[PDB]
Design a protein around this ligand. Structure first.
Ligand SMILES: CCCCCCCC(=O)O
Length: 336
């Protein structure tokens, strides 16, 4: 990991704007760690389709992620490109289908189902590379622990976490994809509709499924990571909105959290922790701050390059059930 900023960029506490990356001007917010001497572990939280970055950082029901700074983490939170650097934008011009080959507009988190997405089969995209540049620049002003760089988020932010872990597994130490998509495809890369993708995992729940969220094909081996995937239970679903305002089911996070857990659990240098709750599709609601503290400290207990055999899971807060490995309570087992 190298600490460097675009020439002349002056990083500051709080809001940073006009950060140049791949022809775009990006923004992000920095909360330096509290009560920490020396390099601090890093948390890069990402909002979803409708909550603003400020909501994700400061509103309790959205996770109040900036509070992890009070927990000893330097929080570096990116603003979505679609928000045009405004951390208060919610769903305006963000909550909807993507353009330029991207599937969904909040983040560059998955290739679209039509051929315009072809190019993103093996190019991480501008958000994944921006986040690396962002953290590398902040690290010139604040002492960051290069073995404890973690990112994570909810919904589309969870999808982005999955993408970033798959394309930058030699940078991040791990992540927290909460109710993110995998955009399951056939083994040959063919995009599947929501319904067909949902059925593909139900038909082979323990297999590693390809997906538009990542490289095609997915990498045979990723760098060392700890990944904690969170499913919100039976109601962890998303209904999209048509131009006329009507709603329709367009995502089910049971197959996508399962698929992500299957891929990461099979990786030899990855510790995968599968967590289930019952709060639905939104930031964890039960004992929210206890969960954020437990989850980030669990990730930090496995610094990059740590032996997976040395990992020891501790009990999560009331309202969560977690274990190392793939999800097991989402689909009936083979042996049953
Ligand atoms: C084309 C359908 C994509 C659904 C994305 C759902 C994003 C969310 O859960 O915030």
């Amino acid at each position: 990991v190298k600490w460097e900023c675009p020439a002349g960029y002056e990083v500051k506490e709080g809001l940073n704007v006009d950060f140049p990356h791949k022809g775009m001007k990006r923004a992000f917010i920095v909360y330096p760690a509290k009560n920490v001497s020396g390099p601090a572990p890093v948390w890069v939280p990402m909002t979803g389709s409708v909550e603003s970055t400020n909501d994700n950082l400061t509103v309790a029901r959205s996770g109040a992620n900036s509070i992890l700074a009070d927990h000893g983490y330097t929080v570096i939170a990116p603003v979505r490109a679609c928000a045009n650097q405004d951390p208060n934008i919610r769903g305006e011009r963000c909550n909807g289908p993507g353009s330029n080959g991207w599937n969904w507009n909040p983040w560059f988190e998955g290739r679209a189902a039509d051929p315009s997405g072809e190019h993103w089969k093996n190019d991480e995209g501008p958000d994944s590379s921006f986040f690396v540049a962002m953290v590398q620049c902040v690290g010139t002003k604040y002492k960051l622990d290069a073995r404890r760089l973690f990112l994570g988020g909810i919904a589309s932010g969870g999808t982005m976490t999955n993408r970033a872990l798959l394309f930058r597994s030699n940078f991040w130490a791990g992540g927290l994809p909460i109710s993110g998509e995998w955009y399951v495809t056939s083994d040959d890369g063919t995009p599947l509709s929501f319904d067909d993708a949902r059925a593909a995992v139900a038909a082979a729940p323990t297999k590693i499924h390809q997906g538009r969220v990542g490289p095609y094909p997915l990498p045979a081996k990723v760098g060392p990571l700890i990944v904690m995937t969170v499913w919100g239970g039976e109601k962890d679903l998303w209904n999209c909105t048509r131009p006329d305002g009507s709603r329709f089911l367009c995502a089910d996070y049971r197959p996508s959290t399962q698929a992500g857990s299957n891929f990461f659990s099979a990786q030899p240098d990855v510790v995968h922790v599968a967590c289930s709750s019952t709060h639905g599709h939104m930031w964890p609601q039960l004992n929210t701050q206890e969960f954020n503290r437990w989850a980030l400290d669990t990730l930090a207990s496995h610094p990059k390059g740590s032996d997976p055999r040395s990992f020891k899971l501790t009990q999560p807060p009331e309202g969560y059930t977690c274990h190392v490995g793939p999800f097991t309570g989402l689909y009936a087992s083979a042996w049953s």
